[PDB]
Design a protein around this motif. Structure first.
Motif, PDB file in Angstrom:
ATOM      1  N   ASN B  47       1.343  -1.201  -0.115  1.00  0.00           N
ATOM      2  CA  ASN B  47       0.433   0.049   0.329  1.00  0.00           C
ATOM      3  C   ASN B  47       0.914   1.295   0.246  1.00  0.00           C
ATOM      4  O   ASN B  47       1.949   1.464   0.690  1.00  0.00           O
ATOM      5  N   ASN B  48       0.589   2.563  -1.002  1.00  0.00           N
ATOM      6  CA  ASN B  48       1.476   3.434  -1.034  1.00  0.00           C
ATOM      7  C   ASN B  48       3.384   3.062  -0.870  1.00  0.00           C
ATOM      8  O   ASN B  48       4.003   3.962  -0.585  1.00  0.00           O
ATOM      9  N   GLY B  49       3.128   2.178  -1.668  1.00  0.00           N
ATOM     10  CA  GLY B  49       4.313   1.398  -1.939  1.00  0.00           C
ATOM     11  C   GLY B  49       5.638   1.491  -0.387  1.00  0.00           C
ATOM     12  O   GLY B  49       6.294   1.865  -0.776  1.00  0.00           O
ATOM     13  N   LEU B  50       5.255   0.900   0.545  1.00  0.00           N
ATOM     14  CA  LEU B  50       5.670   0.182   1.040  1.00  0.00           C
ATOM     15  C   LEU B  50       4.230  -1.057   2.142  1.00  0.00           C
ATOM     16  O   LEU B  50       3.328   0.190   2.749  1.00  0.00           O
ATOM     17  N   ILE B  51       5.071  -2.080   2.539  1.00  0.00           N
ATOM     18  CA  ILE B  51       5.034  -2.819   2.897  1.00  0.00           C
ATOM     19  C   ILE B  51       5.015  -2.465   5.049  1.00  0.00           C
ATOM     20  O   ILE B  51       6.441  -2.383   4.882  1.00  0.00           O
ATOM     21  N   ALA B  52       4.589  -3.467   5.449  1.00  0.00           N
ATOM     22  CA  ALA B  52       4.706  -3.425   6.467  1.00  0.00           C
ATOM     23  C   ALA B  52       4.126  -4.602   7.749  1.00  0.00           C
ATOM     24  O   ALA B  52       3.243  -5.501   7.130  1.00  0.00           O
ATOM     25  N   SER B  53       4.588  -5.024   8.649  1.00  0.00           N
ATOM     26  CA  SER B  53       4.928  -6.081   9.684  1.00  0.00           C
ATOM     27  C   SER B  53       2.983  -5.868  10.184  1.00  0.00           C
ATOM     28  O   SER B  53       2.324  -4.871  10.379  1.00  0.00           O
ATOM     29  N   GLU B  54       2.656  -7.356  10.493  1.00  0.00           N
ATOM     30  CA  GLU B  54       1.421  -7.120  10.458  1.00  0.00           C
ATOM     31  C   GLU B  54       0.816  -7.990  12.040  1.00  0.00           C
ATOM     32  O   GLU B  54       0.369  -7.187  11.795  1.00  0.00           O
ATOM     33  N   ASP B  55       2.083  -8.502  12.165  1.00  0.00           N
ATOM     34  CA  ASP B  55       1.879  -8.749  14.388  1.00  0.00           C
ATOM     35  C   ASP B  55       2.788  -8.436  14.343  1.00  0.00           C
ATOM     36  O   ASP B  55       3.855  -8.724  13.778  1.00  0.00           O
TER      37      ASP B  55
END
Lengths: 46, 108
Positions: B47-55
């Motif tokens: 999303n918006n060229g940025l992945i992030a950790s879920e948990d």
């Protein structure tokens, strides 16, 4: 004598390149417990 | 500049899965001088060229070990990314290092 000329097409050459970057950001800290469920005092027994 | 739609699609194949902590910088060799064991990290959708950790991720570091740099891996044992955590930490007794947020981004 003619002197008559001619005409051509507009031919141009260019090299194009688009670039990007990357950075990784991390945030962590030493564990001091952790969010637990039913945080209550306890009396263990063996 | 590059397109965000392009930035989202390009980042959908990274898919890091395991995270490993190193005491030294693994840039020269991310296959050497490991400290912990591979612990699963799950990422979100691009999303918006940025992945992030879920948990959040808890890594159990053995005793008398130091962690200064981190590295991510995929299913086929291929180190996609490397980095350095905030500050070095020495775990005298066996402790846990928790990962609060990993955000791989390409948006410069």
């Amino acid at each position: 004598t003619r002197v008559h000329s001619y005409r051509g097409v507009l031919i141009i050459t260019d090299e194009l390149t688009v670039e990007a970057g990357s950075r990784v950001s991390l945030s962590g800290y030493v564990s001091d417990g952790g969010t637990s469920d039913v945080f209550t005092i306890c009396r263990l027994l063996d | 500049t590059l397109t965000i739609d392009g930035k989202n699609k390009i980042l959908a194949t990274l898919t890091p899965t395991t995270i490993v902590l190193h005491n030294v910088d693994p840039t020269a060799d991310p296959t050497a001088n490991k400290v912990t064991q591979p612990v699963a990290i799950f990422f979100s959708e691009p999303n918006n060229g940025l992945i992030a950790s879920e948990d959040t991720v808890n890594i159990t570091v053995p005793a008398s070990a130091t962690v200064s740099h981190f590295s991510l891996w995929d299913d086929n044992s291929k180190c996609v990314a490397t980095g350095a955590l905030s500050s070095p930490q020495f775990f005298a007794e066996e402790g846990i290092y928790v990962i609060s947020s990993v955000s791989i981004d390409l948006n410069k």
